[PDB]
Amino acid sequence: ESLSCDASGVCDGRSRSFTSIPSGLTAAMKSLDLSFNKITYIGHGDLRACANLQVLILKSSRINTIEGDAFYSLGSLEHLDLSDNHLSSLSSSWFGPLSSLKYLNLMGNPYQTLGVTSLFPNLTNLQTLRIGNVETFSEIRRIDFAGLTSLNELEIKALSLRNYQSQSLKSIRDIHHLTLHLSESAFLLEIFADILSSVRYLELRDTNLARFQFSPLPVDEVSSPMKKLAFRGSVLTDESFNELLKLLRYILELSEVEFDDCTLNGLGDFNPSESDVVSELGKVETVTIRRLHIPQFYLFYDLSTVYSLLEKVKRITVENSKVFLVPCSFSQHLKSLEFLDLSENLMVEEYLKNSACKGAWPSLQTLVLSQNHLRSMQKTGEILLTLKNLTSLDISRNTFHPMPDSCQWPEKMRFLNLSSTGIRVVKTCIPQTLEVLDVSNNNLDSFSLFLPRLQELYISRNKLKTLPDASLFPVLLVMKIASNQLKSVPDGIFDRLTSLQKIWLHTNPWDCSCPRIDYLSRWLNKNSQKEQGSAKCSGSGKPVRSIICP
Template sequence: MTKQICRVWIFCVVLTTNPSDEKVTNQLCPSCDATHFCDCSSRNLSTIPSGLTIDVIRLNLSYNSIKHVRENDFKRSVNLRVLLLQFNQIWTIDNGSFIFLRKLEHLDLSNNKLTNLSPSWFGHLFSLRHLNIQGNLYSTLGDNPLFSNLKTLRSLHLGNNNSFSAIRKQDFDGITVLEQLEIHGQRLRQYESGSLTTVNNISHIILNLNDVQVLSLMLEDLINSAICLELRKVAFRTPDESSMLEPMSRSIMEKLVLKNVLFTDASIARVLNILGQAKHFLELEMDNSVLQGTGLWNEQIEINRESSFEVLTIRSLFIEKFYLFSDLSGMENLIVNIIKITVVNTNVFLVPCNIARHFSSLLYLDLSENLLADPNLKHSSCEGAWPLLQTFNLSQNSLGDLGMTGQSLSHLKHLTHLDISRNNFGQIPESCQWPENLKYFNISGSQITTLTPCVPQTLEILDVSSNNLNDFRLKLPFLKELYISKNNLKTLPATVYIPDLVALRINRNKLTSFSKEEFDSFRKMETLDAGNNNFICSCEFLALIQYQEAITTVLANWPENYICDSPSSVRGQQVKTARLSVFECHTVLAVSSVCTVVLLVILLIVILGYKFHMLWYMRMTWAWLQAKRKPKKSHNQDFSYDAFVSYSERDTEWVENLLVQELEYSAPPFKLCLHKRDFLPGKWIIDNIIDSIEKSRKTLFVLSEHFVQSEWCKYELDFSHFRLFDENNDAAVLILLEPIKEQTIPKRFCKLRKIMNTKTYLEWPLDENQQQIFWNSLKAALKS
């Protein structure tokens, strides 16, 4: 019972922990991209992610803390092609860990802590082409052949610089062809002869050794298989040490690469003699190596007549006393057949004229990143030097006189390609002398401000990038390609100077735009790189670029390098997707339309104002506001009138025949102010109304249907209300000539509604017997 409970508990623990582990793993290892590549590098993983799916094709688990590769880690990854596990802490791999990876082509286990290698790891990797097990802690490749089942393996990297000490015969069993084999063995001291003979063909073998005797045994096994041999971190200090390379003279090797190798005057001559005897040897390359000495070689260099040594490449060769180096006498026989020489960053300041004349087969010469100056170049390129030279690279030297440079090289009749970039020419002369067949000319990065006819007229390709040019006005009738990037040009070059141009690179200038006419003028244009300029994305330019497919098919790096600089509304956007508003594209039309609309609105306002007396209303409102700001009347103020009569013109008969007669001719008489009679002629009517109301003790409103329809009566009522009625509740007297229903009073007579609701008014009776009572009441109201 207890055992059953324990099993259940363990089962529950597994169920509850696995999902969480997988969840954490998924958080640390993001999902694959569209190409099914999962990049899980540098995520501090301690185990292989458990969430890998069958879709994963490439998996990068490098730079983590994985220690153990378990048997079921890759159970679901049956379609995996690339597995990168370098730079972890792996010290154990279960025997069946890779059994499911039958489609795996690339496996990198380098720089881990594997001490013992097992053939069972690789037994089922039938598709493996690239294997890297360098930088682990093993001392041998094991007791049984590791690679016997890897029939498709083409690239193998093994060994380490600390503990790898022995290679035995069975180590490479099963491998017959390799494109690249790299062996690191700075501590390798034991090599069984014949270990590498099982490999029939090795295109490129890299040996990182320091034991020249072990190296000699390996070279003996590689006589009939290695095509290219690369030696790293080997020191040849004596002729006897160099003699260990003697098997190379009998091999089929075609190329020797020396990286971080040390030579002396005594040893270099022996190496050159060995190479000179090899029938198939074609190319020697030296990179970051050291030559101790001054070039005074006691051993005479002998060259086999059947030798086909053609290519010499030297990069960053360190010669401590380069300024004391000899004139290379004695090497004449070695260089006769060389057709290509590259000597870069090696402090070359002079090529002796005698040596230059012996390069009778030389077609390509690269002396870039050295110390050649104009006088030394003239000596090096003496008459008869490099008679067949076609390509000459003199970039990044100490040249400063373009005219002198051209004169020094003018005798090279076969020279077609010349690179003198990254020198310090600055100002160039008006005319120069150049080789007659020059086609390619690179003068980029030379601080040139203006181009002159000094530039060869025979050119088909010209590179003047990274200078200080403001324009291009040089006539080159045969030019097909122009590289003028990183200058200060604001427009495309005129085709009148370069009518046959096929390719133009004018990126990183100050180009703001170009027109269809400018583009069409290049009738043969196939490639135009105008990216990374300060484009003004006007409507015309956007329309040209966005709707002319013939242009965009020619533009290089379209559309990612074509960005708008202005206007601000589209700054930073790609020219392809930028959109401007109608106002930005049709400014004149938009402004004209707006102005037209504004004028029409103004005209409409003027017409409406004229029709509805808007000006009069505005003046009246102003007068009203001024009146409202006047100080209040004093109760002791002298009045000129007893009452100001506000009435409609249509009620004039009642006012003049009845009201005036009854009030002004009574005893005592009342003095009334009537607008028809008492308003001051020539004075604005509003001012007359205001003055009359203010000079009257009372304001008498004769109300009728005609009154509420009169605009003048409304304003007389308003003035009376704001100036008098608010100050004295008895200042207004209402006479109702005829019944007026409240709902018939227009809303604009809101003041009248208020007065009628708050004050008592007098009604004019139609019965003559009642009229005397009306008059008595009115007179009493006026006297109050």
């Protein structure tokens, strides 16, 4: 039964069970939030008082009818959120007076269309439109987006699109990021043609692409702005690849493809037209696949029908998709590949030995095999010798057996991430060449390791009673060595760390006894710059940058 507020002017009337817009509103209010109530009705005078309001958040209340002129006096309002209400239909009158509006979210309302009069023509300041719904938004007409020339974010949620009039999205000159939700492919070809010259990033959501057929577009030779293409929750078949790949012929400038929580009801039996395979995926440098569900993942094909298509790509991500082998021939065909991220898969040295064959991944500089099932650092590093250009490896989140004294690694490996790796000792396995080492979140009792070049040394969340000798790394730049078991570090330790420029010590059971905590106490002060995280005194909570001693 209470509306609050704050000094700035940010009133918060959230889940107080209202049946009407809170009585008495002030011209001091800059941001009103009346979400999640039963404001079934907004009336003529309900919002005349707060004429200086920049933000009106009415999300998911119970709003089913809003008088036409409800918003007339809100002429400074830039953020309007009516999502998730029972607006059975929309009025052209609500938005006319809001010449200051930048953001307007209308999704979540049971309207069938956007009504018979353009809603947005007089909104020269609009940057973000969100319309549509899951179960009833069914038509898209050419009037619907008249008067809109540019938008940062357009989000049409049209899962139930029964009909899309030709050329609806074409009048819009520039769209920075269009998010479409279609349940099936019936209109994708038609809409894709309308956004060839406007959209800069297309995100397609929740689409059954199972039986998607391509065919040449009516459109004229228009150079497309589109640089990113992303499929969120799509169902795809091996056929879909063959057709979808044909779309890139219209978006020559494209440089990134992404597939998110997508299902592939297939096995990689791709047969790409030959025109497309000569193109080598155009200007697409980066390909990203996350959580691709493949029902019979184990029956997956050679994937050799695309070995030529991908000779030019530079960054590939295939995360949490049950990858268990990148066939050697594939690897040798990924000539131009610089970044490879195979996190959260099924790689084991046995497969990795094939996937990194003698001629594999020639340009690879970064390998990421986090959260796979590796169990021997010696076997791993030795397999990877095939990678001559490898300069940074991440085999973290892999429950390794104890590393030995003698290992080999890529002679240019400057970055090794062994975090969360279960280890409890560090031997001379780790190569001297290492400029960055991350051995945090483990069971290390002592880091006692000569690594000259070593700049950074992330080694937090450990059981380290004692701090490492400052000779072990003469050119050191950083040392994240928090959440540890440090009682107190020897006075005169950052002497030969004439290089250290940032440090971590927080969350640590120390010992702030005036007779002993001399050095630390005053060094942390001289260079408060070189330091993030505030050291907690054991039992006091008082910072170590505090009181010094005579």
